[PDB]
Amino acid sequence: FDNTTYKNLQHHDYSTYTFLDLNLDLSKFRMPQPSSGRESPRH
Amino acid sequence: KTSFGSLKDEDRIFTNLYGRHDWRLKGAQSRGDWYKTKEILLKGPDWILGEVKTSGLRGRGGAGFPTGLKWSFMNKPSDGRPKYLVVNADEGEPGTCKDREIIRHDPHKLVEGCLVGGRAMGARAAYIYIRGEFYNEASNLQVAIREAYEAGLIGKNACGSGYDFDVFVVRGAGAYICGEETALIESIEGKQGKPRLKPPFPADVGVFGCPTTVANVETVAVSPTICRRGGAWFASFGRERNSGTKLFNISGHVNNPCTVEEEMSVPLKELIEKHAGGVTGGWDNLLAVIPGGSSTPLIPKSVCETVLMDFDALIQAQTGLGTAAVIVMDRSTDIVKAIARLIEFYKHESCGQCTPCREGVDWMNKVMARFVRGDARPAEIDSLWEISKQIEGHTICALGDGAAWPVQGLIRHFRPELEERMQQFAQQHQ
Amino acid sequence: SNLIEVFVDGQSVMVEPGTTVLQACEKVGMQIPRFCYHERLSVAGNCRMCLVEIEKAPKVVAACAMPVMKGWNILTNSEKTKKAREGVMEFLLANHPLDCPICDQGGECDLQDQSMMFGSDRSRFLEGKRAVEDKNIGPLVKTIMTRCIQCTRCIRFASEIAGVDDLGTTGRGNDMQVGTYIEKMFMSELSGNIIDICPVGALTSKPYAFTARPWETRKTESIDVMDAVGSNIVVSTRTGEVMRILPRMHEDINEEWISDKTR
Amino acid sequence: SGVNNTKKWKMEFDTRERWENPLMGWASTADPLSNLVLTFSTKEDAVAFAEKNGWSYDVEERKVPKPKSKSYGANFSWNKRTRVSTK
Amino acid sequence: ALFVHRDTPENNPETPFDFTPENYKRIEAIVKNYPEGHKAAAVLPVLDLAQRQNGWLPISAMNKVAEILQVPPMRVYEVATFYTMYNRKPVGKYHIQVCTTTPCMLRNSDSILEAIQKKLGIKVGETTPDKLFTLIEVECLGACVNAPMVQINDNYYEDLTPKDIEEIIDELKAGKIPKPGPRSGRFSCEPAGGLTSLTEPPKGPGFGVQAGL
Ligand SMILES: Cc1cc2nc3c(=O)[nH]c(=O)nc-3n(C[C@H](O)[C@H](O)[C@H](O)COP(=O)(O)O)c2cc1C
Ligand code: SF4
Ligand code: SF4
Ligand code: SF4
Ligand code: FES
Ligand code: FES
Ligand SMILES: [K+]
């Protein structure tokens, strides 16, 4: 049990694309999206 | 009980508030996160909402509506549309930084809360809207969400309960107004963050035009503990209808500005002295406090002596708990300038949609700039009071009310200061 | 059988579900003041000129958007309603330019007329006024956008009626501006109709500029011959000369629009 | 948008020649009824007045705007084209 | 500072821009996060991705985003001009953003702003001639208890003093990267001089759990 150190030092190596790379890796875990039935409100 | 405070560390919900333990899944699990989530999920929405209602929890985003009743607007049969939970992580109120610590140090509490809170409403997914300036915190949350997906805790058959749930994270682009619940929805839909009129209500027509519930990060993150430990445990802290613990941000002229979890209804003086190390220069040096983020009116030293930090106590003092961000100002502060800077903030944040705030807040900003220099007449103080009353209650969202209330608190408690500022200016230019 | 009962200043009226507070008032001959609302456009609810007191409710509601609940008593002439109108009109005029003598909308301006009938009779605005640069959107519609009150009628008309999504708002807050952002013409066979629906002199007829005043024109109700639709029109004349062509409302033909060729 | 000038019935006569005064270019007329406009509470009152005075008349039925269906929530439709793209 | 676009030789519809193949795969992931038939919801993330690739958003960048998502170009112009994190003009390699809202101002954010300008010899809203630094004042950045603070690009530097901020700028000039976070001596938001809470080790799984689960 150590209470005298900061254990959130990972975010010092995050870069420009870190967030959108993780979102790209999560894409395989997602469920199929619902559909409104048309390509868009202008269709 | 008649006195509140001194929350034992074993009764704190955000036990990694300071990030001195591992924030990833292994750390989270060791602290009790994700424990028996399957059993909670199989209890059913009615049981989950029962626990939240009995806990007496109230929304931590600033408005404080009873969470259990609010989440029950979703407990109704699907009409063919998907149902969504939107987690307000915009964290924009000046003085407020509580949601930042939850997101980056206890992300698995938020994720589990989304699942538990999403199950109670019957949602298929959760969108966690987070302000774009929190890039590193958003990345931490993205790492945690991947771990939850990898362990089978979210997604298909979440936790082994057979409930499918996705947790998406979407980033803002720099707008305080996007913390407003309906402007947040508009921002997710790729429009300008302009709040909607109500009705319809988000529980009927929300994100993508679908049933939606918008919940603050703190409100969602505490729900799993309330289910595990029960509403009765939560309702045992704080005054009646002011239940539970609360994250407080103490900033301004304190010795040790910090974030800390503390019982609801703890005295304001106790919170500042116990945790923040007291007012800079001692308690006698206190001028005023903004007890719940910039939108709440300030209260002077005399009121701050004995006021409790809960929803009903602070209303009694002509203010509000808000987000529980305590900004302390000592006697060296130029109180007129401090308030004038907050109006300038609301001028830069107004979405411009509706007339009273688009025009009124910029008007109040121009008047407050002259009040800082005393380049005004005393008759303008009552005019400025009336202008604020015209904005408040006549706008689409509460940002207009959040700009009128600070001005009223200044005029209410420091009118002699304003008048003496004008008298000085007149004497110099005569 | 579906109708519900509401009250407009104590007068009972029977309305269908979904009828707005503004429409209910219209059934007893009360026209609620408005700026952003147009019955042929989608509801916006931003000008806040239609705020009206509901009896026993502490907060005023935007009549143009709020559906009316059964049993509601709408107080269209109460002190709270009057003061809400005075406050909103005060904000609308705070940055409005002192342009009426040089502004073509003068004499047929909803801002002028609703200011006379519903707003206060004097100013207490002691600051300088906003000024906005003028955009160019073709040879038909002249823009003096310092007069714009940000009601978004033109934006809604272009997107929904004309089917063109080239008008929008740029910026935020007090600096929000209506326009095309880029230098772009709004050339649509229906483009001239934004002149009619703009409540102020922000969008005006370029050919008509400065030629006449509304009170001096004679109105002749006639028909259009530029196509086979038969759009109903008004021919404004003055001293034996044709000054301009306006749409005349006909629900079964042109509604309240005309083509740019007709106009 | 005001509708207060659409409450009452009017009676006017057919327009006749106006010409330019040679001296100043003003609009001259020889029609004594060029400015005559009468107001009536109902078309029946107006028809009665025109017949006792011996004028041939045309009566045009009053155009009243039909009731519309307005829904603010329609601006945010899940699957209908009524969804707006800007506010 | 202006919300109307005027074509210049450097910012016009023909100004070249296109997402790289790596960013197109990211775009396909962003869009898939929203229900079918609601692709316009990806305007903010995709527009922010264009900024990350290119540094700022020329009009041609906004035109490409509208084209990809099949939204009218004006609807992308509205988003670009509404949100303050989108750069419609080039900014320096390091976008220095100093919070000056009241909580940060009460802890002397002016001294941070004054120190930076003196160091870089510029003003608020100016870019250095070398085009390495752009300085601006921003509103509350959600890090008030760590005031005064600044954001440079994606990172927060907190608990600053005039000496600390000058150290950060020196490293940025040198080409290094300074670690984000407080510079006072605390790791995050905990009270300085010792914790007043969360000193006992946290309880394990199952602790305090009601019966019936
Ligand atoms: C201008 C403005 C900004 C707001 N910002 C936030 C915010 O950053 N976070 C938040 O939770 N609520 C914010 N709110 C309040 C939300 O609209 C809403 O009340 C809240 O998210 C509901 O969640 P809760 O019931 O759990 O508190 C804001 C409201 C306004 C008017
Ligand atoms: S009150 Fe201000 S922020 Fe809220 S909708 Fe109106 S203009 Fe926008
Ligand atoms: S729009 Fe109306 S109020 Fe404004 S200057 Fe023109 S006539 Fe006057
Ligand atoms: S130009 Fe006219 S119609 Fe368009 S928003 Fe401004 S006032 Fe309304
Ligand atoms: S007419 Fe209702 S808000 Fe404009
Ligand atoms: S006031 Fe500066 S981070 Fe909040
Ligand atoms: K007009």
Curated annotation (Swiss-Prot), chain A:
Q: What is this protein called?
A: NADH dehydrogenase [ubiquinone] flavoprotein 3, mitochondrial
Residues bearing the modification Phosphoserine: S40
User: Which family does the UniProt entry place this protein in?
Assistant: Belongs to the complex I NDUFV3 subunit family.
Q: Which gene encodes it?
A: NDUFV3
| Subunit details | Complex I is composed of 45 different subunits. This is a component of the flavoprotein-sulfur (FP) fragment of the enzyme.
Write out the function statement from the record. Answer: Accessory subunit of the mitochondrial membrane respiratory chain NADH dehydrogenase (Complex I), that is believed not to be involved in catalysis. Complex I functions in the transfer of electrons from NADH to the respiratory chain. The immediate electron acceptor for the enzyme is believed to be ubiquinone. May be the terminally assembled subunit of Complex I.
Location comes to:
Mitochondrion inner membrane
Curated annotation (Swiss-Prot), chain B:
- Mark the residues carrying the PTM Omega-N-methylarginine: R229
Do the record's keywords include Iron-sulfur? yes
Residue positions binding FMN? 171-219
Q: Where, in this chain's numbering, is NADH bound?
A: G59, R60, G61, G62, A63, G64, F65, P66, T67, G68
Q: Which UniProt keywords apply?
A: 4Fe-4S, Acetylation, Electron transport, Flavoprotein, FMN, Iron, Iron-sulfur, Membrane, Metal-binding, Methylation, Mitochondrion, Mitochondrion inner membrane, NAD, Oxidoreductase, Respiratory chain, Transit peptide, Translocase, Transport, Ubiquinone
- GO cellular component, as recorded: mitochondrial inner membrane; respiratory chain complex I
Matching SMART domains: NADH_4Fe-4S
EC number(s) of the enzyme? 7.1.1.2
Cofactor(s) listed in the protein's UniProt record? FMN; [4Fe-4S] cluster
Please list the GO biological process terms of this entry: mitochondrial electron transport, NADH to ubiquinone
Entry note: cofactor: Binds 1 FMN.
Q: Where is [4Fe-4S] cluster annotated to bind?
A: C351, C354, C357, C397
Residues with the modification N6-succinyllysine, per the entry, are K53
Task: Report the membrane topology from the UniProt record.
Answer: Peripheral membrane protein
Its subunit composition reads: Core subunit of respiratory chain NADH dehydrogenase (Complex I) which is composed of 45 different subunits. This is a component of the flavoprotein-sulfur (FP) fragment of the enzyme. Interacts with RAB5IF.
Which family is it part of? Belongs to the complex I 51 kDa subunit family.
In terms of NCBIfam families, this protein maps to: nuoF_fam (TIGR01959), PRK13596.1 (NF010120)
Q: What is this protein called?
A: NADH dehydrogenase [ubiquinone] flavoprotein 1, mitochondrial
Starting at the broadest rank, the lineage of the source organism is: Eukaryota, Metazoa, Chordata, Craniata, Vertebrata
From Swiss-Prot, chain C:
Q: Where is [4Fe-4S] cluster 1 bound in this sequence? A: H96, C100, C103, C109
Q: Where is this gene product found?
A: Mitochondrion inner membrane
Per the database record, which ranges form the 2Fe-2S ferredoxin-type domain?
2-80
Entry superkingdom: Eukaryota
From the record, give the cysteines joined by S-S bonds: none
Q: Domain 4Fe-4S His(Cys)3-ligated-type, which positions?
A: 80-119
Query: Which amino acid positions bind [4Fe-4S] cluster 2, per UniProt?
Result: C148, C151, C154, C198
Location of N6-acetyllysine modifications: K56
Where the record annotates domain 4Fe-4S Mo/W bis-MGD-type, the positions are 217-263
Q: Can you tell me which residues bind [2Fe-2S] cluster? A: C36, C47, C50, C64
Role played: Core subunit of the mitochondrial membrane respiratory chain NADH dehydrogenase (Complex I) which catalyzes electron transfer from NADH through the respiratory chain, using ubiquinone as an electron acceptor. Essential for catalysing the entry and efficient transfer of electrons within complex I. Plays a key role in the assembly and stability of complex I and participates in the association of complex I with ubiquinol-cytochrome reductase complex (Complex III) to form supercomplexes.
Q: How does it assemble?
A: Core subunit of respiratory chain NADH dehydrogenase (Complex I) which is composed of 45 different subunits. This is the largest subunit of complex I and it is a component of the iron-sulfur (IP) fragment of the enzyme. Complex I associates with ubiquinol-cytochrome reductase complex (Complex III) to form supercomplexes. Interacts with MDM2 and AKAP1.
Write out the similarity annotation.
Belongs to the complex I 75 kDa subunit family.
Task: State the name under which the record lists this protein.
Answer: NADH-ubiquinone oxidoreductase 75 kDa subunit, mitochondrial
Protein's organism:
Bos taurus (Bovine)
Q: Specify first residue, last residue and whole-protein length for the fragment.
A: 29 to 291 of 727
UniProtKB/Swiss-Prot annotation, chain D:
Q: Which residues carry this modification: Phosphoserine?
A: S85
Where in or outside the cell it occurs: the entry states: Mitochondrion inner membrane
Q: Where is this region: Disordered?
A: 61-87
| Signal peptide coordinates | none
> How is this chain modified after translation?
Phosphorylated.
Q: Where are the transmembrane segments?
A: none
Q: How does it assemble?
A: Mammalian complex I is composed of 45 different subunits. This is a component of the iron-sulfur (IP) fragment of the enzyme. Interacts with BCAP31 and TOMM40; the interaction mediates its translocation to the mitochondria; the interaction with BCAP31 is direct.
Function according to Swiss-Prot or TrEMBL: Accessory subunit of the mitochondrial membrane respiratory chain NADH dehydrogenase (Complex I), that is believed not to be involved in catalysis. Complex I functions in the transfer of electrons from NADH to the respiratory chain. The immediate electron acceptor for the enzyme is believed to be ubiquinone.
Similarity field: Belongs to the complex I NDUFS4 subunit family.
- Protein name, as recorded: NADH dehydrogenase [ubiquinone] iron-sulfur protein 4, mitochondrial
Q: Recall the taxonomic lineage recorded for the source organism.
A: Eukaryota, Metazoa, Chordata, Craniata, Vertebrata
Task: Tell me the stretch of the parent sequence this chain holds.
Answer: 89 to 175 of 175
